[PDB]
Amino acid sequence: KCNLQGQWRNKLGSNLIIESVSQNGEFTGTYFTSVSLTNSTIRISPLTGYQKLTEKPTFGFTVHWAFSDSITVWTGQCFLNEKGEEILHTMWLLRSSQEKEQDNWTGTRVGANTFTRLS
Amino acid sequence: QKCNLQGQWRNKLGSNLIIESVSQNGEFTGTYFTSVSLTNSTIRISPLTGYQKLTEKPTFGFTVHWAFSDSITVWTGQCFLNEKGEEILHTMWLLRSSQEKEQDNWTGTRVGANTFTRL
Amino acid sequence: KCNLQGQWRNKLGSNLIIESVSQNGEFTGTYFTSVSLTNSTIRISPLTGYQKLTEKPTFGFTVHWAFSDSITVWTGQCFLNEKGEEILHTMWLLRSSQEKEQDNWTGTRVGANTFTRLS
Amino acid sequence: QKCNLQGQWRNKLGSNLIIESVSQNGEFTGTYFTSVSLTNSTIRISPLTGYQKLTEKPTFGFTVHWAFSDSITVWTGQCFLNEKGEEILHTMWLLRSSQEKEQDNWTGTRVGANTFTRL
Numbered sequence A, C: 001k002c003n004l005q006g007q008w009r010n011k012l013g014s015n016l017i018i019e020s021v022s023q024n025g026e027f028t029g030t031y032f033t034s035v036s037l038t039n040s041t042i043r044i045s046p047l048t049g050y051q052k053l054t055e056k057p058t059f060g061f062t063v064h065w066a067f068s069d070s071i072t073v074w075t076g077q078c079f080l081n082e083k084g085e086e087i088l089h090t091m092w093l094l095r096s097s098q099e100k101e102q103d104n105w106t107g108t109r110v111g112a113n114t115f116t117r118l119s
Numbered sequence B, D: 001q002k003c004n005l006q007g008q009w010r011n012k013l014g015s016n017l018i019i020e021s022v023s024q025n026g027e028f029t030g031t032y033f034t035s036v037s038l039t040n041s042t043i044r045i046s047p048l049t050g051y052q053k054l055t056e057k058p059t060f061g062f063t064v065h066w067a068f069s070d071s072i073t074v075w076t077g078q079c080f081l082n083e084k085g086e087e088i089l090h091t092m093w094l095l096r097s098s099q100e101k102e103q104d105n106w107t108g109t110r111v112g113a114n115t116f117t118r119l
Ligand SMILES: O=C(O)CCCC[C@@H]1SC[C@@H]2NC(=O)N[C@@H]21
Pocket: A010, A012, A014, A033, A034, A035, A036, A037, A038, A065, A068, A069, A070, A072, A092, A094, A111, A113, D106
């Protein structure tokens, strides 16, 4: 357990799917967000990242949003909770595209996400 | 120049960021050589993977898979041309350190800014 | 509801007490953390901050830890959940004291906290 | 100088930070005049309250209660003497914007760094 492959959901209802993990820790997959900053139609978006291949692995990944000019990165660690269920504790940075360097200071949001298996 | 991220970059800490040819979909890989680290372990060159947007003044994000520790760092940011026409990467980062227990998770994520320019 | 006065707890088990709120939004109180970075004895610590006096108020405060050289700031907003119970959604920055400016980059942690009334 | 925070400070955005006499317990108040804001509303001088540590190279934190918007910003950081003996405040900040609904909470917190020096 704490295999990162497969499907996960966060408390927002977003879906993270990790398709494969390589021996050097590299992984690829897709992200489907339940929420967004604008009203454009949300589309499945690709991700790439890395995990440690340790007990309780740390990891990070980037999502290249297919429907906006934003990028989000997450980093976190996997643990088993009290019930022995896998949980990914993460923090994220959401970069929005600014028109000019003078507005750069406005361009980065932060938050936490908690991912668990689909019940 | 028009913020194609390919090439050598340096931040104010003196870390070296090297980005390879950006793929048609914006995906890139590269290497990171940090000038600073959390402990006394010898710093080794580390791989990175990420994406950039394909628009003017691109947003981007990437993950560095540290070769010498159990940590992971992610950056996200946006490239602008400064006042001198010179390119500049404005970034924020999250550094995840590996914790031994789920109860210590709250301690595991550092945050900062980095500013990268061409050498 | 969303009066900030009185006692609150977060998921770590920490206790936030807001003693009074003034007409200009200023508030004072104490914080008792259930967790810390070191092994020194945790002691009740003072806080000062401000809230908006609006529906669903935003707020921020600083805790002057009495038992370490750290400082933490929180900012967030109060809402009523589905049950009609008050909830404070917050993000925090924990600054630890560094010995030298060269290590400044290591000195700031980030996370989320969720505060509710004692049940 | 020894990082007593009393006085006038400026950051790279050009915002003005003014801190009054620090009390015996480290508490301070002051005023903040930002050079930049999220919307087109006219910027007004805004009050702040916070604390500094009483040790060499003090950590500190404060909250600004914006007089012209429903937002709140908190900063935390540490004062060092740079290489030129000149004092410098290294900070990170969280800017909370007021959301209309609990469901939009994830959008409500921006993050950045600020660097303050004496005028
Ligand atoms: O709106 C955009 O421009 C892109 C989608 C951003 C969705 C964010 S990423 C952080 C948070 N966690 C999620 O599952 N969705 C939101």
